[PDB]
Ligand binder design. Sequence first.
Ligand SMILES: OC[C@H]1O[C@@H](O[C@H]2[C@H](O)[C@@H](O)[C@H](O)O[C@@H]2CO)[C@H](O)[C@@H](O)[C@@H]1O
Ligand SMILES: OC[C@H]1O[C@@H](O[C@H]2[C@H](O)[C@@H](O)[C@H](O)O[C@@H]2CO)[C@H](O)[C@@H](O)[C@@H]1O
Lengths: 809, 809
Amino acid sequence: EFGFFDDANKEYVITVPRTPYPWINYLGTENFFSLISNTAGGYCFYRDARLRRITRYRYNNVPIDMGGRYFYIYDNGDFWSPGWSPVKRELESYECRHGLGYTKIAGKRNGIKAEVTFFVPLNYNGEVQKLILKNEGQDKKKITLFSFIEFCLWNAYDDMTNFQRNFSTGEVEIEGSVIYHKTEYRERRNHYAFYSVNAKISGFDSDRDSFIGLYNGFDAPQAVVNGKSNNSVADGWAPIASHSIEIELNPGEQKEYVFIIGYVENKDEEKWESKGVINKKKAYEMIEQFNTVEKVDKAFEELKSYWNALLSKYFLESHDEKLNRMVNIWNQYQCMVTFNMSRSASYFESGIGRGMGFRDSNQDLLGFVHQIPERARERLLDLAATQLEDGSAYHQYQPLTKKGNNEIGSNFNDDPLWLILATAAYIKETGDYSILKEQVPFNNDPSKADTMFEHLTRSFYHVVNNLGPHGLPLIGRADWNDCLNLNCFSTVPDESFQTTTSKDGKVAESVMIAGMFVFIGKDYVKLCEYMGLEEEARKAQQHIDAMKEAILKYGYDGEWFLRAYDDFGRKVGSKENEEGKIFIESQGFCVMAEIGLEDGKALKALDSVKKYLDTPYGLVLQNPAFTRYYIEYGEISTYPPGYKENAGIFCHNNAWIICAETVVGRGDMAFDYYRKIAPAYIEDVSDIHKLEPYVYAQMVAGKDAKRHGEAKNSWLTGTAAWNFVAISQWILGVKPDYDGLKIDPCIPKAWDGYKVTRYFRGSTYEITVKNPNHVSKGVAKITVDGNEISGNILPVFNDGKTHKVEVIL
Amino acid sequence: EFGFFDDANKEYVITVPRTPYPWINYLGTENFFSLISNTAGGYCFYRDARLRRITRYRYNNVPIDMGGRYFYIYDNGDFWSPGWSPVKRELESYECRHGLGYTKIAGKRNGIKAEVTFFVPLNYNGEVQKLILKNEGQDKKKITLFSFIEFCLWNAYDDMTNFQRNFSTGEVEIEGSVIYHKTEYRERRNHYAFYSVNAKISGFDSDRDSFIGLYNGFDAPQAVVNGKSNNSVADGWAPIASHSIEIELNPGEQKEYVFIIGYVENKDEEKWESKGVINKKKAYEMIEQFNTVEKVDKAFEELKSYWNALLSKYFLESHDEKLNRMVNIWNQYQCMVTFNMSRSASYFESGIGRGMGFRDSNQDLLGFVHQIPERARERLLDLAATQLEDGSAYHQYQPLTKKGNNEIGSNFNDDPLWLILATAAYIKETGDYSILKEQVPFNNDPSKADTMFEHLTRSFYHVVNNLGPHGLPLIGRADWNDCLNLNCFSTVPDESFQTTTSKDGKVAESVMIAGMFVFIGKDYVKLCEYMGLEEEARKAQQHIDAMKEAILKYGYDGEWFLRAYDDFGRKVGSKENEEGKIFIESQGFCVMAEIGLEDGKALKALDSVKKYLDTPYGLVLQNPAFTRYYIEYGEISTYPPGYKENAGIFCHNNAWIICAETVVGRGDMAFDYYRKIAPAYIEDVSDIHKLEPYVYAQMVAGKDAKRHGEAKNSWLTGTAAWNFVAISQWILGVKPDYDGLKIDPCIPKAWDGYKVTRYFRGSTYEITVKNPNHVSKGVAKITVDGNEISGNILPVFNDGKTHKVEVIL
Ligand SMILES: OC[C@H]1O[C@@H](O[C@H]2[C@H](O)[C@@H](O)[C@H](O)O[C@@H]2CO)[C@H](O)[C@@H](O)[C@@H]1O
Ligand SMILES: OC[C@H]1O[C@@H](O[C@H]2[C@H](O)[C@@H](O)[C@H](O)O[C@@H]2CO)[C@H](O)[C@@H](O)[C@@H]1O
């Protein structure tokens, strides 16, 4: 391990700066966003990492994670950094606390302690850094403090490619203790950035080559080495911001400073104070907002209250402290962060993309719908507005413009069903059926607008109408697995596997889409019945039954469910195949659809999953891994064995196996699968996992990889939402439902019980589950407010009170 | 100064490594290309810096220029680099010789000297590095040598943006002393790279985090610090190549090693030696090709002979050694390099672009036509094949695919005339009129193909058919000045100034295009007369005369020539304007067209140019500089004053001013303009110039900038070609022409004379010019082989002999 969980403060405490990888945190809630590592590396942006990046950051750098908010303490020739980077001189003590929306970093050297709190306050377009300098020695000290950030030229791709122009465009202004970055403000941009401190400065620097030196690195800037600022004014090349303050500290005396990285937008008419001088009124207001430590503390407390209110809708009390900290703090926090950040910027996503997946946007809603219902409803309507008339969807949704990517296009045939699933989840959470009657346009065209229920109908009948030779849905470009491309057949290195199609797409089928169709058609039929359309519900049920028969006749291999048929009409995921005899997605979604429950097919498939796909670090996508390129399969075989979609552990689809295990009533298996990938349970092998031990990652190397157990692409994935749904609804049995809160746990037998406090439709339910006879599944009795009820659906109160619920299995 | 010229060896010798900016050189002639700095930084690629990059390089890095071919000498705990980078430990001696297609770097520390010669041999797909280690001390030594390169993932944009996939794709093999990089070779790619040394190694490394360490930089890799290789095999993340050799050196003993960075392409049926093992036959042949120092020396001598033959067609003997070294070595070398490299990769061009300008290829042809006439003919035909049917051209030409960029498009209305100018230059150089009768397609469509002369006709009549209200040519998106956008009117950031047009383009005219039309229509009329089309020649002359009258009536401001009219119909470049009262382009091209020679208008315009645009470092584009954004002008006013097109020194049009000065017979002024920007004449202010003192740069900061005199965007520009044409043809007076070689010098009066040896149409002319009366212009007598001739056109011999020519002014 490299740290520990602090549950009372809801923090992760990193105690050594050399983590196996830089472990990061996110700051900001609405528009200003910051990525900050445990050594204070990273960068910030305003609403768009691609088009409004404020500070410069280099991905895949040597050394890693160089560039950030760098403070230099200069003490009589010696100099060091509180985060131990970039200087990397040994510290008496180091600590990084990653909290909810904030990060604290403390470092000590030669009797001088520096503590910095970084956070983005609510309704504020800036990152606030509170710095405490304390003299813990026995002698009076004279030191110099240096701040440093490196600006980006607002357009990351242009900033890293277009030097022939942009080496001559960088412009700054320096006034008082504020350095303003105003590149291209003179022509078309109405926005600028600033770096300020709330104290009189001894000097400044705004030219990178003056502060650092051409042949020096971040670890030893020449101005810091010499102990004084050069007072350089930037002119092209690389604009930066640096203050220098000369401080005398008596023994036991401390001083406090507030540094602000701020973003300002001006109206085109109010752009100039005079000729060539930017208007600084908004920056003055922003800086005065946080010119004392007391105001910063008030904002910090308000952010704490905001996050506490966000996390308070689902509270678990069990005997397992790791489970408690996953359910109560970190899973919900990651779900909220994933809603705030989409898939834009991480230490693996470089921030140059244009949007996120349509299916990913729908799937995250299942995770965060219980925390932000109104924003979830707005997001659902926005996603539905981009749908095409035929019921298909744009593969990439852009939340910034609320539009679909026309360049990427459509023909990912699983995408429409996710909209129905997310809408059903929203309705079951809130009970708000009115969303079905909203007027939603098609293709963002107000002229052709219909009800939201009509959008769901088109989504259902897009699958109904695009059936293949066996009656299973046509896969198209791909399904949930974006690397299963059965219509590509690509031989040329530079073409995309997802948008290049050399086949008509009339043969290749997906049984994973078939399982999704059967699973989500129940919700569609229920919504048909709510709308008063009995014939429509009957016809939809007929189609669902036909799909179920098709899955039984052509989608089962004998001991597990098949994966697909290719353009040749050959089975994918069959025991007759040499490699890839069994995939994981079809098993999970077919068992979740209750197919094979009575004849033992589902149990056989789950036993096969355990036999062939199980590892100590999770379940691999398919077995055996592909050891060569398969032109008929697409991108999946292009990876080396055990990585990404070629038999890696995709923790996103492990949650479906967890749910399916709850379906057959095996709670021990479900919780054992849950524990293998939950961050709090692998904190003890953090060195093997190598990524953050407090958030889910997308991918863990499988048993065929030499790095078996190592993670990639952390912090930004649909794993958090689906795993929270699996643990909180399927295992713990607190399930939203159309008529109310359903209680149906499936837990390990040895558990004596637990309790969950759930806020649901305007009321609080304190549900205590007991297991006197140690079973896994089956409710014997439910009592509400002292009175026995019938069934497993709790009454809806909507009275703002607390109701005691007592459950005996 | 940071070095000196070595004329006998044709090298520039850099003597201090802390040079004001990394000074680079190019290696390779046909397909394999290398950029190498004076500290051995840079990278290689195969024909395409964008899609076939072999080694990784980080632009705009901190510290600058980190990453390259890094050799580490480990001596009993100490370690250092012969290029002084990346280790940056002080050396007893350092030297870098930049030659023609090769670079030598020598470094000495603690009695150990390391000398490395880098070059790409002819007809070889690899970079060869010959390393000599010498013990110059008095004691026997035991050392370890480490090599290091960092691989790229073949697609630089993908390599720097797509970590979510490509952190799991990196693959290598290690066999003997060769490390093979084969990422995606198991897949659609049929090419791989290798790093070899011709000796048994003590160890290797192929994983970056094992050789270097996650938190270490290039300056102190952990394997080098420990003095031992880790023998790591890469698996995803960052593949690298490193050998380690343990060497014992007696006093006075030296060892020799050959390192090769090689590129191999295999046939799809011969990709594998066995399952999972790449076929290494071509790599074995390539490595055996240079496994001894003698073979490397033979290849080095062959490269030297090739480069000597390339520069031998124009040889100057004057009293000025700086002029001699510019004309004989460095200008011609830069012209050939610019033909080989287009505008793809420099230390300012990041290698991500798709091609070069159509006008830029045409203009470079003028520079290199005397060195490679056959390749110039092929390039001319390739450029003409992309022309549209109406005579317009695609703005960006892509020499790799020999096609125009359809996304960028057309409507740059000066582009077609450059094709006529380049074709006329080729015909004047070679006398080969047959190129006019070649069948050339339109829009790369063989069905619609016509003669090359028909292409020139369409180019000529595009201007005739796109005249404006005053009879001057419509400017369209832009003319030669790509930042003068009079139809854009953009208020929104992140949209191209060159391809966004909010006006119909029926008002704005360009005086510069009018001057080009008059200047190049003479050549078009001559070519019309060659084909026997008398009526066509008469009609073309009528159009030229009409353009001349239009320029005289509407293009002259009273003291100088106007620049343009905008979409409002207002004068651009007029004394009535508050800023930008005079531009430089119109003066040069109108005087070159001989428009105001008799009435004193041309002399008046040149005097105005001297009065308003002249600086000690060159001539600025326009005066006064724009101090605010002008929406009606486009990108030109978006720069800060004195940079790029906003009153920077564009050395490209200084050559046109030099030619115009020769036209009015003022040789002192022309040579004074030539000297201000010629690299050999500013080597003494190298610290101010800051870029390479042996090649031209695109841009020097103007008198309105605080960095007045500083250069940007070196090594890749049309400045070299036009300046060589200005010095060698207009000042020295050796001008190719129809019917032969014309002698018409315009030189400073104080010169006594000079001599030029010129290879022209199969014969050599040794031309001695004498100035007994000390005039600037005017030929009194010409004698060939002892017999006085009439006129100033030399006879064509085509006999492979040398002919003595005496010219008396
Ligand atoms: O396959 C599951 C997951 O794939 C995501 O697409 C990735 C893919 O994982 C990767 O192999 C490929 O190289 O890049 C794409 C991104 O374009 C997809 O974004 C998810 O929606 C999907 O669940
Ligand atoms: O203007 C002369 C020169 O311009 C080149 O275009 C550059 C331009 O200099 C720069 O200001 C702008 O930002 O980028 C473009 C490149 O797209 C052009 O390439 C040359 O042909 C032209 O001679």
